[PDB]
Design an enzyme around this catalytic site. Structure first.
Site, mmCIF file in Angstrom:
data_model
loop_
_atom_site.group_PDB
_atom_site.id
_atom_site.type_symbol
_atom_site.label_atom_id
_atom_site.label_comp_id
_atom_site.label_asym_id
_atom_site.label_seq_id
_atom_site.Cartn_x
_atom_site.Cartn_y
_atom_site.Cartn_z
ATOM 1 N N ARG A 1 0.807 -1.211 0.000
ATOM 2 C CA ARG A 1 0.000 0.000 0.000
ATOM 3 C C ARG A 1 0.845 1.269 0.000
ATOM 4 O O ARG A 1 0.299 2.360 -0.190
ATOM 5 C CB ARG A 1 -0.940 -0.008 1.205
ATOM 6 C CG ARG A 1 -2.048 1.015 1.118
ATOM 7 C CD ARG A 1 -3.235 0.443 0.375
ATOM 8 N NE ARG A 1 -3.689 -0.815 0.959
ATOM 9 C CZ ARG A 1 -3.909 -1.928 0.273
ATOM 10 N NH1 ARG A 1 -3.714 -1.984 -1.034
ATOM 11 N NH2 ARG A 1 -4.336 -3.012 0.914
ATOM 12 N N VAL A 2 2.155 1.159 0.207
ATOM 13 C CA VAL A 2 3.064 2.305 0.165
ATOM 14 C C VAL A 2 4.251 1.905 -0.710
ATOM 15 O O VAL A 2 5.229 1.317 -0.238
ATOM 16 C CB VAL A 2 3.508 2.759 1.559
ATOM 17 C CG1 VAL A 2 2.385 3.521 2.237
ATOM 18 C CG2 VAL A 2 3.872 1.562 2.424
#
Ligand code: ADP
Ligand code: MG
Lengths: 52, 171, 118, 337
Positions: D203-204
């Site tokens: 997600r990052v």
């Protein structure tokens, strides 16, 4: 074309001088490494035996 | 400190596309690589080669043997001296290499000087349409010898003469 | 570390061939072996050979197999499957690997099928 | 099952020895393993493995044996979360691997089903989602006002026959900040990390990554998109033209490179040259199988009179234009040999 080929011997000897020197130099400078190997093995055995 | 040595070694390797076919130069290269890799591996994995008697002994309470092993290690601190045996055979290899290098560079320098002389002569001393046949005979007696030998042999053929020269033969 | 990096590599390549075989089963059924390239065809044939070779007669199942059981040593089987993976036995039909022990048994069965049966 | 979940957990666990042996606490990352549902023999394997690679000193083992009571299995990840929160709230960074946690799920299912609580889906109780979410949300990166501590979670899900579209799997995926998918398909296909680049998403992406590895040359950033393209036009797709052949070769060489032996944590100062070599000089590799030894030889090459580049990319973090030129020159020199 022969001239162009011979142009490349002009400075090979100067570099291969230090090359051939340091080759045997570094190959024979592992004597201190060989002497350190047995000391390292003795230290490893000592640490293992006291861990035992 | 080692960076210069292997930098020049691989510089010679980059020059070595022309001396291809060597047997043990690359083998010696991997030998040096293996030896230095074993060097750095043993130096990195080498923990401090001494028993921490201040703490690593105090944890053990009924040892009765730490003193013995520590005394043994202290008595065996001079495990062995360095082996600086090679002082003449390596010098022999170097004097052979110096002789080869100096004779090589003498040959190279004389060859380049000769071939600049050759090109300088060919630039403005090339009688393509005004060369004297008598001059050609005087320069090289070998062609004269060949001509008399083949004349006395009776074989008037000159093998490989219609390959590049035409005939314009009306026949 | 436990196996020895040789038997481990042999097992890894056997798994490679078998996984590729299972992945290609769908198009093998639908299209066939012709659609695959030479490398894929060779891989499928080799994987079929290994999968046949996996069959081993058991001494407690002689009444079922009809063939005396074979006890293959670990070194024997790893050497046999290493030899198979290199393609040294590609010419041997895959049926010669059926209900056999070592690679010597594979050679014997291939010879029997090629001479007595054919 | 046995697709490398605890294995990748272990490589993550062991890689921290590079920084935990130093002095900078801001880079030290203390470890907490949650052995819930694993057998005692596996936990002994774990503790001895951590002992060998100088890792047990900074790691924490919270073992919830299957023979132990189901409430213990239910509670052990929560207690390990509290242990990690201790480090997180004191300015330290903690990595807690919620390994299994499906065994914790079934243990809590047992708790509910003998506590007279009626179950929900497939006999799982109502708050398995709430349980997982509440347990995982304790892992966070605290702000500077709170000590700048962090608590990193590495949960696991043991899918049944690759069933990602199941209640517990998709439930936990909706909690975690991305998932790492491993199937037996890639495990036997050769990919040793078994990293399924498709369903594995973080997600990052740009953040939480080494600057030398994030984008530097651009291709390292759309690395994931390139992998997705390679999957979309794999060998099943028709080899259109020379561009398609080059793309297929690039993808095959790249997935060849990603394979990594177990218990061999490869540092970022060594990861970056290899990823860069996967964009230039990758296509002319001599056979796919030889890239395994090519990687080791390239590491050795970077070690010899190129440790300046390695320490430069390790310390600075970012890559300069001159650094990129030097890396390109080294890659060309190596691929020439
Ligand atoms: N580099 C690697 N990555 C992942 N698995 C590996 C690797 N090398 C060997 N293996 C094998 O894959 C298996 C990984 O399964 P594991 O992570 O133990 O899953 P589980 O803990 O759920 O059984 C191990 O048994 C190991 O033998
Ligand atoms: Mg596991």
């Amino acid at each position: 074309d022969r001239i162009d080929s011979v142009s490349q011997l002009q400075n090979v000897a100067e570099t291969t001088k230090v090359l051939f020197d340091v080759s045997k130099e570094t190959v024979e400078l592992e004597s201190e490494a060989f002497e350190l190997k047995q000391k390292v093995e003795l230290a490893h055995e000592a640490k293992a035996v006291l861990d035992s | 400190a080692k960076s210069a040595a292997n930098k020049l070694d691989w510089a010679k390797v980059i020059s070595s596309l022309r001396i291809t076919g060597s047997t043990a130069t690359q083998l010696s290269s991997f030998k040096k690589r293996n030896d230095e890799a074993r060097r750095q591996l043993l130096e990195l994995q080498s923990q401090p080669t001494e028993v921490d008697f201040s703490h690593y002994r105090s944890v053990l309470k009924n040892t009765s043997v730490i003193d013995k092993i520590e005394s043994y290690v202290k008595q065996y601190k001079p495990v062995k001296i360095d082996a600086s045996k090679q002082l003449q055979v390596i010098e022999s290899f170097e004097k052979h290499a110096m002789t080869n290098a100096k004779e090589t560079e003498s040959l190279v320098s004389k060859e380049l000087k000769d071939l600049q002389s050759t090109l300088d002569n060919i630039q403005s001393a090339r009688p393509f349409d005004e060369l004297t046949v008598d001059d050609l005979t005087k320069i090289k007696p070998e062609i004269d010898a060949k001509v008399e030998e083949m004349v006395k042999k009776g074989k008037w053929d000159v093998p490989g003469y219609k390959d590049r020269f035409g005939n314009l033969n009306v026949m | 570390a436990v196996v020895g990096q040789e038997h481990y590599d042999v097992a890894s390549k056997v798994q490679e061939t078998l996984q590729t075989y299972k992945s290609l089963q769908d198009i093998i059924a639908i299209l066939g072996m012709d659609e695959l390239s030479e490398q894929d065809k060779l891989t499928v044939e080799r994987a079929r050979k290994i999968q046949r070779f996996l069959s081993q007669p058991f001494a407690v199942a002689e009444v079922f197999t009809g063939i005396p059981g074979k006890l293959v040593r670990l070194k024997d089987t790893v050497a046999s499957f290493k030899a198979v993976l290199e393609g040294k036995y590609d010419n041997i039909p895959e049926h010669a690997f059926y209900m056999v022990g070592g690679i010597e048994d594979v050679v014997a069965k291939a010879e029997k099928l090629a001479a007595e049966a054919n | 099952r046995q697709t490398g979940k605890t294995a990748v957990a272990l490589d993550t666990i062991l890689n921290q020895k590079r920084w935990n042996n130093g002095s900078d606490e801001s880079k030290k990352l203390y470890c907490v393993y949650v052995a819930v549902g694993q057998k005692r023999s596996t936990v002994a394997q774990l503790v001895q493995t951590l002992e060998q690679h100088d890792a047990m000193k900074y790691s924490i083992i919270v073992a919830a044996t299957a023979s132990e009571a189901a409430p213990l299995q239910y509670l052990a990840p929560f207690t390990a979360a509290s242990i990690g929160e201790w480090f997180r709230d004191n300015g330290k960074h903690a990595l807690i691997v919620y390994d299994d946690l499906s065994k914790q799920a079934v243990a809590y299912r047992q708790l509910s089903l003998l506590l007279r609580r009626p179950p929900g889906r497939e006999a799982y109780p109502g708050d398995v989602f709430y349980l997982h979410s509440r347990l995982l949300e304790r892992a966070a990166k605290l702000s500077e006002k709170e000590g700048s501590g962090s608590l990193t979670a590495l949960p696991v899900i043991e899918t049944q026959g690759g069933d990602v579209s199941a209640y517990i799997p998709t439930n936990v995926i909706s909690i975690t900040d991305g998932q790492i998918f491993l199937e037996a398909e890639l495990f036997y296909k050769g990919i040793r990390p078994a990293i399924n680049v498709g369903l594995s998403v973080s997600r990052v992406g740009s953040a939480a990554q080494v600057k030398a590895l994030k984008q530097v040359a651009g291709s390292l950033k759309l690395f994931l998109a390139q992998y997705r393209e390679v999957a979309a036009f794999a060998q099943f797709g028709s080899d259109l033209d020379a561009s398609t052949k080059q793309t297929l070769v690039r993808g095959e060489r790249l997935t060849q490179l990603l394979k990594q032996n177990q218990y061999s944590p490869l540092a970022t100062e060594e990861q970056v040259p290899l990823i860069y070599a996967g964009v230039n000089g990758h296509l002319d590799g001599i056979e796919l199988s030889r890239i395994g030894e090519f990687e080791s030889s390239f590491l050795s090459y970077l070690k010899s009179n190129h440790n300046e580049l390695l320490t430069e990319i390790r310390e600075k973090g970012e890559l300069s234009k001159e650094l990129l030129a030097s890396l390109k020159s080294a890659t060309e020199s190596f691929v020439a040999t």
